[PDB]
Design a protein around this ligand. Structure first.
Ligand SMILES: NC(=O)c1ccc[n+]([C@@H]2O[C@H](COP(=O)([O-])OP(=O)(O)OC[C@H]3O[C@@H](n4cnc5c(N)ncnc54)[C@H](O)[C@@H]3O)[C@@H](O)[C@H]2O)c1
Ligand SMILES: NC(=O)c1ccc[n+]([C@@H]2O[C@H](COP(=O)([O-])OP(=O)(O)OC[C@H]3O[C@@H](n4cnc5c(N)ncnc54)[C@H](O)[C@@H]3O)[C@@H](O)[C@H]2O)c1
Ligand SMILES: NC(=O)c1ccc[n+]([C@@H]2O[C@H](COP(=O)([O-])OP(=O)(O)OC[C@H]3O[C@@H](n4cnc5c(N)ncnc54)[C@H](O)[C@@H]3O)[C@@H](O)[C@H]2O)c1
Ligand SMILES: NC(=O)c1ccc[n+]([C@@H]2O[C@H](COP(=O)([O-])OP(=O)(O)OC[C@H]3O[C@@H](n4cnc5c(N)ncnc54)[C@H](O)[C@@H]3O)[C@@H](O)[C@H]2O)c1
Ligand SMILES: Nc1ncnc2[nH]cnc12
Ligand SMILES: Nc1ncnc2[nH]cnc12
Ligand SMILES: [K+]
Ligand SMILES: [K+]
Ligand SMILES: [K+]
Ligand SMILES: [K+]
Lengths: 461, 461, 461, 461
């Protein structure tokens, strides 16, 4: 008689459950934590508000937290990223989840609100797991009294960490947080290799376009930009890379990419004259990866080669000026998450017009919107970190401390390197890899313990 | 009338000078510093003891320091790494240099001593530029009075930095140092991409072996191991990777390599029984990249496939147990830096014996020993950092500080990120790359200045 | 009032039509033929029985033949390869098509029969377009009177060509054929690069498995094996290749793959003892590419690592002994075209059993079964060849020739090189590529016409 | 007391002999033929004029022919391709060889003449082995009476085969020939993979330039162009490809290269206006691979980016207009086979001029001129074919036939596929590869013998 959920189609549960069982076999770090901590129940009494893409991989995360003793209430952090079979399997297990693929913005906020409210009143939540900071922001702005009982936030992604650090700098962050993004087994695994796997996957599913031999422009060359450029280059695209950070641009050059700017001499002065129209007129695919605002702007969209594909793999859709396209150009839906944007005008469209762009996922995160996001064996690292971070902040019991004790603990921290290494070891063993053990003499020679950690905290990998 | 040098053949100078003029055109960051600072003469009065591979690239470094006002006395930090035409060109310019390819160990020490002593007495040195820490160690052990007047050390390489940090922790470091290795435009340029360019280069020059289709084992997957594995994989080798650090091993797996140990279950217990003989018996090439001791040990050498190539690209030769091979097996020189090691015994050799290994550079740094090390356009980054570090420590004038002020400044530091970025920008422009400029709104959106720095100090790239 | 069709769901037609309009923009060679020949109507009077995967790409092929004057009746050549929106769009256009994704074998035969018969009697067919030879075989065995009036067969694929050549050698082939497979713009485009695009695509859609870091075994290294191995290697798989042809195996070695056999010393003597159990126990993915029989046999399936993925990209499913798996092991459907094969026995299954294989598309062509097959821009080459071949055989009018003249024309031929080159030129222009024109002196120097052909017929590319 | 030779330095013989002994271990097909045929002496009585690059690999070929009973007289087919240690080792073995690195054109012709003449009179030669057709041409034009006693020519390379086919077409070829180039274990091994190994090798040895991140233009995309493009792309160059053959251009696009022409719209009308100056002004490296004339012409050389590298890997230097550069621009030798070409004029040069090109090997085959050509394990295939071809033509005894028998045998033929496969098998075993044996049922299923051949003669691989 469980009704405390909202999903697209509960009859997808058995399919979702089959995929969860496969995903468990692909997630040895996460399932190792389930086995290790199940007897101890370290999350007994935890009540976790979770806001992260309701995929099969998030399902394994949810059920690990529950297996460790937690209660949860769950929503997705993006309108297109839910896998409806994953949501159904979680709801069928008696877990409150409010998520479906293809929400409206109003439905998106309503879903988050259904996690925060139980029976019309604030749930007695005491932990937060977030991806991008939307739940964290709603709590601080609209439900500040609830933060009086919450011990911590564990934040998944680069954009969400930025938002937390802004709150900390401004003195508005109310509970301590763990930056899960910056574990090496997250940032340099999920952010990079996850996008390598799933960017070309999403473009193929949405368009079935041949990529070999065509010209791509990747805006950004951080972790997501690195993985995205490789996703395209390994398919045979001719990839050009734009960057504002000269160190990242240096890496792009050494990795074998030509570094270009959409703007003449790199100067974005707001005029059409500043656009390198020759460059943009040759691009078949543009991908934004920055976490910044308006990096694929209206003048760039006007200058792109006819029939170019436009997509964003950063957290928020404002990387592309889709608002300009909504105001000026006609949208022809090809299928869900695939639209032809007719640059002829806004008053209907000609089904045979040759002057259109193909926009994927309406500019929302394309790997999750047009495919299934990162694969389970990659998300294993990110979500093992999430579980460890939830255990730590819940055990620390910040909400129970005296006000003086709270002041010294109000921070944004990362996990210790030793735990990062232990997650990595389980990942390596999952591939069948065999890590060598240092001899006592070798450990002494390089100045480390045989057990690790093996690198100083300054090490960049 | 200049005689204050010792090189292989001074008649090679004109050839060296032609290569220096080409290298200047490949080193825009370093030559940009030469142009920016020449008028100001920031190194006027500096007297630099330099100990680093006497290559064409080091020649451009030397002449940049001199162009900024320094005097120098120079030696190589490896017995096989000098390019004799580079050494000749520097000596022909009136610069004291003591370096040739193929020194003995006694000659190597004598060359360092010739930089320290001028006319039989300590030179009036006040700065140190070092690669690996050998000059730094000799000064601390044998010439402490000279360190009294030295303002700082700028150290090039991972191994040298480790030695500095040991001295700092023991309270034996006498002057402050800059860790040049850990600029991103050094570590994630030189250490990685430099070895990608130069490892396969050296193996080809030493052996002319086809690499495609053959089996390689790379010991280590830090920056050098990453570049080395790519150097071989891009040639079509089937590359396996060993590691003690599970995070580095995770990267190897995600990069498409099989992670293996020379020892059964990774346990190095000193017996032949622990060697994975089946694995080592299929390896055609082994490369050590660790900075550690005895990572290609006697039992591994005994188990390698007949005619395997053995080489080391870490700083010191003790990565491979070459002492064991000198004691037990006969060495047939093919040509300089290429030896067949006959596993039949040590009492002469059979020129037609099939049971040998090919050892490159007698186990010393193979890229420099059997080829020319990293290319100018990569060394541009490392050496622009060296020049900036020399300017900073020389301007700080630590030797002239009172004892109480010395105590506050005795440290090992890295260059600020802003300078790292400015070096990278010159490198990118050298490729013809165009970096984009943030708009004021974008810079505000991500919380940075339009001029940078663009990343927090914690960022790993 | 059109009812002469059978598809899954006619309401998918508008979606299919949108994808056809996109595919037209990705198929410049095929659309160029449509424009070049539309006025001349070279297929006026042609009545084409077509049997080839009812995809969007085949839709553009069908509508090109119709635009040139043909009437057609169409079926798919595989039970899982139809895209239902493509079938719907073709039926909605008034074209007889009998095809849906997920036919039974009985439905598959019924669909072919519906093209052959119209209103219960033989259609007035005079041309055949086939992929794999199934329609060709049915006509020869069951409808010889129909072949009397058929001018030729244009055969798409390696397996179908082999079947034609068998009939020719036995004197049972009744009408001439064009081997479309062996145009360079087919075999060395479609067979190789098509599988490079679509193999990893299908595995991702079926399983969402990370491929990087895992072990693959590709059986075969012809055109399909070459593209398949690249599809996996570019994702970071560690790919091993099996072959019976030592020249193809040599290419695999030089391409950077380890060449292995499932059998000890390559000897397939039918016993379990001949299986290299150590090798197969480390394989995460096996792909068959051979066009041969039982190349992934029962003993290999028994020896594979638990949870390995098993798939076939050759034309027919008998490359894998799926009959053995149907007889002995329980099948758990995950979703359409994805089955867990439980090696515990056949009397039901345990949903949590760890000892299963994942079989894709029930062993049928995996790229079409689990994804969408090759992309439009690659199929452009194959299908431009098909149109040219249909024009040529239809113009030759073999059925109308006297017996003595038929005897001189009964053959299996390829298209002339000049047409192969003209197809390629349109493909290159589609990428924006610019082919250089020889000067008269250069053309004389190498002995060719400025217009081509540029290579002798013996050239292998 | 052997004096019938001319080499650079006979004291290099011991070094050459050590490298020959290593090369034997890298050439299993060739050494397998030595072992197989040594007892039978199938070349007893053969007297072979040989004209092919006097490398270590050619040394193993020579000594295989001698071991099979032949006498030989040898020269190089290029002025820069000899390895002086290889020439010395052969001369020290008592084999007549006339070859050194850095011959003049006059010395080149004199060396060929020393093979043709013994003691001032024509040698009683009866077999010819040639690479490029220079010896074959001299025999036909200047020594036609010698061809009356010669049983055949075995020709190594694409350009030499073209010359033979021209003679055959004109009725001027006097003896039958075997096209060794067109074995698959030659053309699709040597021509492609050999250049992949040795192009980047030669550029690194000549210039030590970083290649990653720089722009290359490869003229041609046949076998040499394919291997050359990969040599550069795998180092991280951004490679553009020019072609006159649209099928080869199609392959370039699908392999992930942008296809461009040096001429606007591909039209080479002889004017400077036709040069795409924007394209050429961005190219850092141009490589000619065509076997054609003037594919890197004077107007292209004028338009290249300052400091671009120019080289040719086709057989003859006339691919580049070096004559134009000799007449107009000053040459500054950096070192042997490396020249800066100063575009400021011809009246001396400024050592610091920035407007120069770097020409490698004076436009002669760059892999052999600036490095050591293809590696032994690749040349194994080519030279096993050469030995088989020499055995066959010598056994056929064309010169001894009646005039009527000669007419029916005057042809240019390739080796049978069965032998091509047997060479390939030895190559595969050299990598440790294991070829699978077909079962009787499988061989029947695909219509081949279990022993091969496995493909029809039309197969392109
Ligand atoms: N879709 C996914 O699965 C996924 C995964 C991880 C992270 N993310 C999101 O992707 C975004 C990027 O994350 P990251 O970890 O790569 O961050 P990052 O900071 O490592 O990289 C962002 C890069 O963008 C560059 N950049 C900023 N403004 C630019 C501009 N105007 N033009 C060009 N380059 C510009 C920055 O210099 C930086 O190198 C964030 O929004 C993050 O939350 C998405
Ligand atoms: N030849 C060159 O041009 C060049 C360039 C840069 C640095 N170096 C030298 O190369 C060495 C490595 O430098 P780095 O910057 O890559 O250091 P690093 O710390 O980044 O990498 C060394 C790696 O070796 C691994 N390792 C240690 N012991 C091991 C063992 N027994 N088995 C397997 N892996 C083991 C460590 O876990 C680590 O990841 C140093 O000696 C450095 O000075 C050489
Ligand atoms: N799925 C697709 O889209 C697609 C595309 C083109 C062709 N095909 C089909 O794929 C198959 C292969 O086509 P192809 O053009 O690559 O043929 P091919 O003749 O070029 O290659 C087949 C290869 O299999 C090898 N082989 C045969 N028996 C073997 C065995 N027991 N073990 C290992 N290797 C073995 C052969 O030596 C040969 O090199 C055919 O059935 C063809 O019709 C499928
Ligand atoms: N250096 C080496 O080790 C080596 C090895 C093998 C062959 N070769 C030589 O290399 C040359 C090429 O041999 P191949 O086997 O690759 O021949 P190929 O016929 O396979 O390729 C030559 C290519 O050049 C193209 N081409 C011709 N004129 C052109 C032009 N003006 N612009 C652009 N492309 C043009 C042709 O279309 C063709 O595809 C020959 O001279 C051959 O003897 C050298
Ligand atoms: N599959 C996935 N599940 C959850 N969050 C993700 N972020 C990226 N891919 C994801
Ligand atoms: N190493 C080599 N020896 C002889 N001929 C060659 N052609 C190309 N490389 C060669
Ligand atoms: K997924
Ligand atoms: K160098
Ligand atoms: K498709
Ligand atoms: K060689």
């Amino acid at each position: 008689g469980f009704t405390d959920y909202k999903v697209a189609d509960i009859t997808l549960a058995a399919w979702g459950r089959r995929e969860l069982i496969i995903a468990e076999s692909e997630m040895p770090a996460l399932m190792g934590l389930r086995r290790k901590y199940a007897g101890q129940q370290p999350l007994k009494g935890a009540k976790i508000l979770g806001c992260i893409h309701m995929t099969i991989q998030t399902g394994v995360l949810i059920e690990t937290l529950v297996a460790l003793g937690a209660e949860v209430r769950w929503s997705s952090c993006n309108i297109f990223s839910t896998q409806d079979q994953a949501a159904a399997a979680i709801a069928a297990a008696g877990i409150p989840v409010f998520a479906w693929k293809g929400e409206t913005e109003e439905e998106y906020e309503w879903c988050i609100e259904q996690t925060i409210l139980k029976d019309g009143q604030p749930w007695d939540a005491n932990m937060v797991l977030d991806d991008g900071g939307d739940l964290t922001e709603i709590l601080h702005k609209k439900y500040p009294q609830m933060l009086e009982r919450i011990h911590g936030i564990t934040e998944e992604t680069t954009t969400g960490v930025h938002r937390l650090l802004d709150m900390l700098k401004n003195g508005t962050l109310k509970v301590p947080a763990i930056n899960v993004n910056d574990s090496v087994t997250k940032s340099k695994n999920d952010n990079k290799y996850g996008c390598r796997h799933s960017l070309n996957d999403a473009i193929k599913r949405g368009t079935d376009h041949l990529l070999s031999g065509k010209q791509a422009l990747v805006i950004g060359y951080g972790d997501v930009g690195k993985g995205s450029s490789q996703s395209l280059r390994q398919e045979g695209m001719i990839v050009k890379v734009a960057e504002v950070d000269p160190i990242c641009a240096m890496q792009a050059c050494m990795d074998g990419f030509e570094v270009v700017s959409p703007y003449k001499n790199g100067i974005n002065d707001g005029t059409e004259a500043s656009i390198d129209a020759a460059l943009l007129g040759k691009i078949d695919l543009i991908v934004t990866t920055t976490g910044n605002v308006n990096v694929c702007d209206a003048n760039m969209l006007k200058a792109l080669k006819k029939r170019a594909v436009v997509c964003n793999i950063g957290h928020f859709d404002n990387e592309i000026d889709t608002a300009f396209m909504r105001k000026n150009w006609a949208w022809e839906e090809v299928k869900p998450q695939v639209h032809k944007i007719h640059r002829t005008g806004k008053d209907g469209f000609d089904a045979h017009n040759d002057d259109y762009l193909i926009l994927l996922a309406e500019g929302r995160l394309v790997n999750l919107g047009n495919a299934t996001g990162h694969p389970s064996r990659i998300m294993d690292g990110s979500f093992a970190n999430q579980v460890l971070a939830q255990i730590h902040l819940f055990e620390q019991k910040y909400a129970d401390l005296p006000a003086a004790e709270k002041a010294k603990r109000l921070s944004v921290e990362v996990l210790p390197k030793k735990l990062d290494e232990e997650v990595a070891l389980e990942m390596v063993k999952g591939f069948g890899g065999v890590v060598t053990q240092l001899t006592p003499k070798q450990a002494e020679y390089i100045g480390v313990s045989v057990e690790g950690p093996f690198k100083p905290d300054t090490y960049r990998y």
